[PDB]
């Protein structure tokens, strides 16, 4: 903890948390994502992507259209504040982003953009 | 035919389609919604609401807040392009709207605003 | 219609129906499955598999263990009343089964066995 | 904590955990469910129900058909190992059950039976 959180995406298309809080004193924040399941990336890949709650749907829709090879994210999507790579069973990836990119009193969402996963794999992030 | 679509929302909280293409030649377009289930409106009510993808989240959140009596939609919400009433088991409702309200290049989303249903009851609509 | 149904599974990991009624006057019933999406079989393949509600979990878990080469279905699983092949984008398949293999008073479920899909891709089949 | 777990069901149809482990040395185990949301029971009611993974579908289908007044659970359902009542905003309920009712090498699932919630509100319970 302290300017970091560890999150897991499993073979049941679930993240193990629905809410992340970022302490306003952190200059940067790190998310460390792992996949504890046994299914591969092409079947059950997960990423953790952060955007405003208003932008989540356009990011998910354009992410599906970019496809597989682009980790289901539009290249240089300006609405994505930070994201990991798409990972499979046994893998891990971290992303560190500057907390100054987040406003107090704005709602943010984290989600996975693998096709169909965002319906269940999503949660809120808020500054504290 | 052609400028209309029949959509069902059932007791599994799912629509029977997640993509609607509106033909550029239609002067108007009709959505015919029915609820083939057995559950009452106060527990599994569904409506079909249209907005841009960017506005979806605000419409769902203010909708949730307006309550069952307002069909979970903010009264006179300017972000709502077109909508049906909230219907329960065995009911039907239709909405016809002007296609000039849509423009090519914009991403639209249709969804249900009953609390929690948009997680699964959502789809894209595009003018082609 | 009546002694056959057309079903589709899409890129949003959803079937277009979650309840099928088989008329007792049908001696045989045909299910025609299509995949109207763009994702390939190994990422978003779908099949239509029928069993009793009590055997669905067993069929899904062992199906998952059999892998893609087995269309995610255990070879000669006796709990499966009928099934299609696993199809990907733009493919289709059909299966016909005898209605006397069904009895009134028993709960049946149709579902997809591609890993993770059964949570949303499932529905009831009832003999009426 | 020791032989007990605290779990929350929110307005986004999410449990705050998706995996419960019960230690074999516990003579009994307690689940304390709360609803930190603002939506009422008819809209977003949640309960915690435990059965084998095999029986979950039967419990969910029959639960749906029992009605709001029956807390969407079939009265005296033999397949339910333990359950809470259906609670709404600001409510709380607990269930303590005998760990002798669980056997090793059997898969258990906990889920909510409010219509449409089990697709998202479900997790595994394991005896170690
Ligand atoms: Cu994912
Ligand atoms: Cu709805
Ligand atoms: Cu599938
Ligand atoms: Cu619930």
Residue ranges per domain, chain B?
1-128
Query: Could you tell me the distance, in angstroms and rounded to a whole number, from the CA of residue C64 to the centre of ligand 2?
Result: 31
Q: For A1-128, CATH number?
A: 2.60.40.420
Tokens (6 digits) for A25: 């004193």
Kindly tell me the sign of the dihedral angle through the C-alpha atoms of A104, A105, A106, A110. positive
- Compute chain C's Rg from CA coordinates: 13
Please count the residues of chain A: 128
C-alpha span between D32 and D91 (Å, rounded)? 11
Q: How far is residue D85's CA from residue D72's CA, in Å, rounded to a whole number?
A: 9
- Please state the three-class secondary structure of chain C as a single string: CCCEEEEEECCCCCECCCEEEECCCCCEEEEEEECCCCCCHHHHCECCEEEEHHHHHHHHHHHHHHCHHHCCCCCCCCCCCEECCCECCCCEEEEEEEHHHCCCCCCEEEECCCCCHHHCCEEEEEEC
User: Which-ligand-closest: CA of A71?
Assistant: 1
Instruction: Give the Å distance between the CA of A118 and the centre of ligand 1.
Output: 7
- Choose from D57, D112, D116, D117 for mutation: most chain C CBs within 10 A: D57
**β-strands B108-111, B49-52 pairing:** antiparallel
Helix (H) or strand (E) holding C62: helix C56-66
D63 neighbors D50 (Cβ within 8 angstroms):
no
Residue B8 and residue B33 in contact, taking contact as beta carbons nearer than 8 Å: yes
Interstrand relation of C4-8 and C28-34 (parallel, antiparallel or unpaired): parallel
CB-CB neighbors (< 8 A) of D61 in chain C: 53, 107, 124
Angle at B3 between CA B1 and CA B7, to 5 degrees: 80
Phi, psi of A33, deg, nearest 5 = -105, 135
Neighbours of D28 (CB within 10 A): 13
Q: How far is CA C17 from CA A39, B117, C5, C48, C81, in A?
A: 27, 17, 10, 12, 19
**Cβ of A67 under 8 Å from any chain B Cβ?**
no
- Shortest CA distance to D82 belongs to which of D8, D30, D18, D5? D30
Phi, psi of C21 (to 5 degrees): -110, 130
* Strand partners for B9: B15
d(CA A15, CA A10): 7
Rounded to a whole number, what is the distance in angstroms from the first to the last CA of chain A?
14
Mutate: best of D14, D17, D46, partner A, most A CBs <10 A: D14
Method used experimentally: X-ray
Find the residue in B nearest to A119 (Cα). Answer: B119
Residue by residue, what is the 3-state secondary structure of B68-115?
HHHCCCCCCCCCCCEECCCECCCCEEEEEEEHHHCCCCCCEEEECCCC
Judged by DSSP in three states, D100 sits in helix
> Which residue of chain B is at minimal alpha-carbon distance from D67?
B39
| 3-class secondary-structure state, position B128 | coil
């Amino acid at each position: 903890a302290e300017c970091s959180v560890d999150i897991q995406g499993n073979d049941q298309m679930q993240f193990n948390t629905n809410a992340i809080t970022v302490d306003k004193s952190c200059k940067q924040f790190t998310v460390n994502l792992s996949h504890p399941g046994n299914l591969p990336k092409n079947v059950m890949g997960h990423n953790w992507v952060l955007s405003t709650a208003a932008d989540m749907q356009g990011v998910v829709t354009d992410g599906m259209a970019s496809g597989l090879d682009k980790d289901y994210l539009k290249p240089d999507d300006s609405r994505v504040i930070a994201h990991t790579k798409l990972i499979g069973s046994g893998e891990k990836d971290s992303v560190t982003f500057d907390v100054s990119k987040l406003k107090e009193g704005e709602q943010y969402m984290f989600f996975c953009t693998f096709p169909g996963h965002s319906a269940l794999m999503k949660g809120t992030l808020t500054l504290k």
